[PDB]
Amino acid sequence: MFGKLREKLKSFVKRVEEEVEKEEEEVILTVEIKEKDVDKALDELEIDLLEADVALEVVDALREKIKQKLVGKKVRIGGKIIEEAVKEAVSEILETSRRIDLIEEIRKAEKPYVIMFVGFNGSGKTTTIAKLANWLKNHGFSVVIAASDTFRAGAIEQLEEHAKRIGVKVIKHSYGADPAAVAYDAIQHAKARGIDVVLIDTAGRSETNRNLMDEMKKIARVTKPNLVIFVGDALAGNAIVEQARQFNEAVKIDGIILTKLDADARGGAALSISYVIDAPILFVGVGQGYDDLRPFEKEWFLERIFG
Ligand SMILES: Nc1nc2c(ncn2[C@@H]2O[C@H](COP(=O)(O)OP(=O)(O)O)[C@@H](O)[C@H]2O)c(=O)[nH]1
Ligand SMILES: Nc1nc2c(ncn2[C@@H]2O[C@H](COP(=O)(O)OP(=O)(O)O)[C@@H](O)[C@H]2O)c(=O)[nH]1
C-alpha cells in the first residue's frame, strides 16, 4: 500500500545520502547538505512522483518544502535525519486550511446535521455512507439516510439492504422520484424525531435529462447541507482529483473520503488530493466490511509511507 510512493521517497533519501557521504569522504566533525546534492536528486524525484500519479502542483510544493528543510543543515560523519525532513514536508502538504472534527461539530451543531455526498458511480459512495452511519451510531449518534439516487434501477434497494445490516432507517420515495424531495423529506423527518444526523446518498452519472452537476446543485440548494463530502476511489489515480475539481465548482466540497486504499499500491492521489482541493480527508475506506472505515490522521498515513 502506497508502495510506489514509499519507494520513490526512499530512493530520494538514499540518493542525497550518497552525495553527503562523498563529502564525509573528502574528509571537521560535521557535514553540510548543499544544493548541488539536492537539486539533482530533486529533479529525479519530480519524475518519480509524476509516475506515481502525484498531481503537478503537489510535486512542485513538495520540492520546495524538501529543499528548504535540507539545504544548509549540518550532519555528523559516521538516513533517519534526511527522511525526517521529507516526512515533515509530506505532513505539511497533507495539512489543510481548515480542520474538521466530525463528532464535535455535530454535538455542537443544531440538529439535524445534514451531510451530502457527491461522486461518480463506482467510487464507493453508497458503501461509504453505510460505513459512516454505523460509525456515528457506534458513537452515540442517531442517523438516517436519504435515498436520493432515484434514477438508477436498483440503487434504492441496494441502499435499503445496506441499511438493514447496520440497522439504520432509510427515508425514500420510489424509482423515478425527485432526488431533492426525498432528501427534503428525510430532513423534515429527522426534525420531528429529533434525530442527530441525516446522510444523503446521491446519483453518480448524467441522465438524458439532467447533467449530474446540475442535479447536485439542485439538491444542495434544497437541503442546505452542513457538510458536503466528496467520495473518490483511490485506485482511480489522478482522475480522482479532476473529478473533485468538477464537483467543487458545482457545489463546494468541505471534506473527502477516499475508498479502496486496501488496494492502492501507488498513493499518489491520496497524497495530492487533499492539497489540490483544500479540504481535509476525513475517513478512508479499507475494505468492503461496514467497519472498514478509518478516521484519517496524518500519522496513519506517514506511518505507512515510511516506517
Ligand atoms: N476493496 C474495497 N472495496 C470497496 C471499498 N469501498 C467500496 N468498495 C466497493 O466498490 C464497489 C462499488 O461501491 P458502491 O458503494 O456501490 O459505489 P457507488 O457507485 O459510488 O455508490 C462495491 O463492490 C464496494 O464493495 C473499500 O474501501 N475497499
Ligand atoms: N418520505 C418520507 N417522509 C417522511 C416520513 N416520515 C416523515 N416524513 C416527513 O416528515 C414530515 C412530517 O413529520 P411527522 O411529525 O412524522 O408528521 P406530520 O408533521 O403530520 O407530517 C412530512 O412532511 C414528511 O415530509 C417518511 O416515512 N417518508
Numbering used by the authors: 1 to 27, 36 to 86, 90 to 318
Manuscript text:
The process is mediated by evolutionarily related signal recognition particles (SRPs) and their cognate membrane-associated receptors (SRs also called FtsYs in Bacteria and Archaea). The core proteins of SRPs and SRs are GTPases that each contain a structurally and functionally conserved NG domain where the G domain adopts a ras-like fold responsible for GTP binding and the N-domain adopts a four α-helix bundle fold. Here we describe the X-ray structures and solution conformations of FtsY, the SR from the hyper-thermophilic archaeon Pyrococcus furiosus (Pfu), in its free and GDP•magnesium-bound forms. The low resolution, solution scattering data complements our high-resolution crystallographic analysis and shows that the crystallographic structure and the average conformation adopted in solution are similar. While the overall architecture of the archeal receptor resembles its previously described bacterial homologues from the SRP/SR GTPases family, the structure of Pfu-FtsY reveals novel features: The elongated N domain lacks the N-terminal extension observed in all other bacterial FtsYs and is instead characterized by a long N-terminal helix αN1 that packs against the NG core in a different way; sequence analysis suggests that archeal receptors may cluster apart from their bacterial homologues.
We tried to co-crystallize Pfu-FtsY in presence of GTP. Although SRP-GTPases, especially the SR subgroup, are distinguished by their low intrinsic GTPase activity and nucleotide specificity, the crystal structure we obtained showed the presence of GDP•magnesium bound in the catalytic site suggesting that nucleotide hydrolysis took place during the course of crystallization. Identical crystals could be obtained in presence of GDP but not in presence of non-hydrolyzable GTP analogs. The resulting structure was solved at 2.0Å resolution by molecular replacement using the apo structure as template. The previously reported Taq-FtsY•GDP structure was obtained with a receptor that lacked the first 20 aminoacids and contained no magnesium, which is required for the association between FtsY and Ffh.. The structure reveals two nucleotide molecules, one in the catalytic site and one located at the surface of the protein next to the IBD motif unique to all SRP-GTPases. The refined occupancies of 100% (catalytic GDP) and 69% (external GDP) and atomic displacement factors of the two GDPs are indicated. The GDP•magnesium bound receptor adopts a conformation close to the one observed in the Taq-FtsY•Ffh complex. Our FtsY structure identified a second and distinct external nucleotide-binding site located on the surface of the receptor.
